[PDB]
Amino acid sequence: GVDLGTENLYFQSMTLPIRLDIAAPLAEIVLNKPERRNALSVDMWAAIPGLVAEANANPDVKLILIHGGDAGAFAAGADISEFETIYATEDAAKASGQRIAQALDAIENSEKPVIAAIEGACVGGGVSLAMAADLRVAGEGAKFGVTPGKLGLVYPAGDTRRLLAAVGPGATKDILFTGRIFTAGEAKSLGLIDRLVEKGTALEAARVWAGEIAAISQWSVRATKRMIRGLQTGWTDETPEAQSLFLNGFANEDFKEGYRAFLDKRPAKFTYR
Amino acid sequence: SMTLPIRLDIAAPLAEIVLNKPERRNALSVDMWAAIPGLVAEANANPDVKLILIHGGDAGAFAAGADISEFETIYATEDAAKASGQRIAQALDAIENSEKPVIAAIEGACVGGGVSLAMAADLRVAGEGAKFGVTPGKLGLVYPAGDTRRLLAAVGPGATKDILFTGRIFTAGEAKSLGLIDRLVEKGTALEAARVWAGEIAAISQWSVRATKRMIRGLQTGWTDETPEAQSLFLNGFANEDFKEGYRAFLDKRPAKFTYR
């Protein structure tokens, strides 16, 4: 038995403003500043790459979810109380940008797929988080907006890329040129979110969707994600990586089992973790 | 100004490129195409102008294709045809690359050159009853690279092939559905809708608006997250006069009054 520690350590671990819950085959990145409607702070951004790494290193985890817990919001934009710190100097502002880019890139490049489950406010950094995920499900009543234009800022290259790829140039320009807040219904219509469900059911829907993906070959799921990311970043049909990834399709432990299951006339029981 | 087949109206914070050949339903002529880069430049140089609109005025059409009366002249020789192509490309590229955003407000016929004009704009709103078509295939021509690129980016390969392979005329409803236009509004209200939409964009940071357009164009022409120009554009976000004000306004809990022009 590992040492049970102290109340202060326990309280510190619960009050972390973002955390990773493990419930195999899921890991859940839970935004956990409910008293500020999950407005994104420095320490939240700083923690994300570590949480993503933890989920990816745990073999019981197949899929990662990202959601707002019981805050009643996904993320209500940036925390205005930190504005004075993050923008005090050019250096602090630059570091803020890097910290955010690292968090978003870590989510985007996660070996394991990431599903965002969105209720209530999903604004600014919230949209950026959501778009870094592979898949997005939102409850009715959720609200979306990207607002650097209301501040005199510009949305970064990565965030803009991810948005463009989902909604196209016209819709991206509308969103960013106006900074307007729009409904889940419009988000669905624009292609910003992939599924629209009944209010308060996004998390359950994400879990069931994740369950479906978890049931198939995880070798395939992860390879698929690499293939897609590869193609988005310039791979062609001739690219050696793309060819070898395809050929590894026939040489991996899941296909070995899939092939055996087809011959034995039984369900496949995939083992790749 | 009212005899001019195309003109620029200034009504701060808007500039409006108004097509004005109502007797040919704004069919595009050499002198219209030739004037466009100058009108765009004028709008971009005027600090009172934040947004540019393109529309068909009171002709009842956005643009009813090419002017048939000039066909003979433009295509008489290989040289004339080449010059026509260059002139049109210059007009469309000028619109596309406008530092300030451009919104097309479309009523009635939007055919051929009309679609090209519309796709060069950043944003498109059309009234119901507007009609769309791209018809070089009906003549033995090919739609240029730039025009094709812009169409592809909006509607995707399948839809682009449908449009160009058939040369068919389709409704505003279908155009909306395909992603060719961004907004579909009640017939006769496209201009008003474009003005209000432009109003919304005008109210925010114009530093941001213009930077956003550069970032997007950059990403479309090969920029990555690592590209130096993309990084410096982002960092200039924290160093510009609008952000200084935006930051203050967020802390004071008042509307931002942005000054960058």
Next chain:
Amino acid sequence: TLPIRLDIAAPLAEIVLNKPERRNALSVDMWAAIPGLVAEANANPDVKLILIHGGDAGAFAAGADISEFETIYATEDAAKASGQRIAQALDAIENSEKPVIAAIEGACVGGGVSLAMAADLRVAGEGAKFGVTPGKLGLVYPAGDTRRLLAAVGPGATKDILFTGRIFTAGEAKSLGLIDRLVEKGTALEAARVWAGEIAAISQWSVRATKRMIRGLQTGWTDETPEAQSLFLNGFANEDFKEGYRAFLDKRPAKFTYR
């Protein structure tokens, strides 16, 4: 009973899948034949458009043929050759000089989707079913097939399709942009023929040049690319335009001759 064939009925050529007893499940010999059929259609001057459909099997293509699984995947080398063979077939369809329209009824799964996405245009009947299932076997969808899917439906929808391997309806396929037209059940072939008729009526020089321009732009051409510029300029110096220009001056219908 050839398992795949080319029917000529000017101005159409039709690539007809014809293994009804397996609901047109795709085999080695089907894949191997495709580049030749495409070449035949393209070389025949009476042919303007190519259709691809499942004939009277009641299905477009019901995935891969399970009976050849053992052979194709017996070794790394066989599997690699399979991949090359399939890629050649799909690339031949995609790069066809003449446009290709897929007419889809019933099952369109796996290789079926790959075939459909290689075509330029897709029309499906209601009741058609779609799915891409390499994930259910431990395989990965190839680069070319994935590219073509992405370009039509976007990253989110592509991930949904491939991560789940789920079977979805023609209605959802239409909604996702996977197919271009959705028609009444059992009418996809007739709809494809009429659509092909419309395209056949205009300049085939333009149709083919348009396709090259688009493919060019997708594979890295810019407005400055020499091939893009010369393709545009050839628009004014081909036999169809020469006729189109004459017809305009004479005030008569154009009768295009390029084939």
